[PDB]
């Protein structure tokens with residue numbers, strides 16, 4: 458009943474979309490809503506490396522952006538109609554995910570621009586960016602791009618934003634390909650669960666209302682939490698708590714500290730595991746630390762799993778990111794003053810030397 462569009466923009470966005478398509482193939486098999494996916498990139502090598510995305514869903518936008526957001530923005534304007542045309546060919550959508558890193562040149566610049574245009578064309582749509590944050594010790598440009606991208610995302614007034622923190626989720630040491638795969642798999646798993654949840658309880662598109670209410674609360678930024686219980690311990694209470702603890706989140710929000718203002722908790726699993734009274738009692742507990750909590754139960758054969766959609770009131774982790782971008786930009790300037798300073802100093806040294814020379 459739900460028309461969903463997923464747009465993976467830039468390399469990171471492309472790879473997340475590919476993980477979505479990967480996992481979606483498995484979901485399709487079990488089945489015995491329309492979900493469109495477009496991977497958008499200015500680098501054709503990236504689109505070539507995709508493995509589970511149909512050729513028709515790979516959109517090359519000609520023309521080198523690198524990590525230059527200015528060039529990215531220019532690139533978008535030059536190809537804006539072509540990009541939007543590709544989207545409009547696929548009909549109407551009720552729900553749009555725009556997936557990108559905030560640190561590159563293509564994803565981070567196209568995405569806020571694209572959302573602006575999409576909001577005009579699909580006024581009734583729920584449009585949700587999935588914003589992937591850089592590794593802590595990624596370079597200066599990555600941090601700077603991140604800071605300005607996040608600003609534009611808020612400015613463009615989408616329906617909230619799901620934060621994905623590469624640093625917190627970072628695994629496999631120097632094996633960045635494995636790190637990306639773990640992260641991308643977690644994002645895709647959560648998004649697919651989210652879409653399933655929204656689609657199964659749906660009688661009308663206005664049923665996206667509660668989700669929008671959460672996403673538009675507080676800072677208008679949030680994240681997804683997740684926990685799959687095992688057969689041994691199917692406790693819903695534990696399952697609910699574990700999806701709300703940092704280790705369960707895509708971004709390390711501290712729920713116990715009251716950083717989350719709103720939440721949607723979805724419990725999915727075999728009917729025999731689902732005690733409505735118990736679930737209700739657990740949700741009531743959350744209102745201690747979380748202002749408004751909505752809940753959904755989805756019956757589907759399996760050991761229970763929980764998805765949490767959190768909305769943030771506070772995000773100290775993002776402030777830390779901003780300060781590091783700031784510290785970075787500044788250090789480059791001081792490095793340029795010390796060079797001018799030693800050069801001025803050298804000239805004064807030479808003057809004394811020449812003056813000593815002319816006196817002999």
Ligand SMILES: Nc1nc2c(ncn2[C@@H]2O[C@H](COP(=O)(O)OP(=O)(O)O)[C@@H](O)[C@H]2O)c(=O)[nH]1
Nearest residue numbers: 467468469472558560561562563564591637640
């Ligand atoms: N989680 C995740 N992060 C990625 C992936 N690829 C790149 N990144 C991160 O995304 C940022 C680079 O942006 P990228 O999408 O590669 O640049 P773009 O193609 O110009 O938009 C850096 O912070 C990378 O660490 C990926 O597959 N998964």
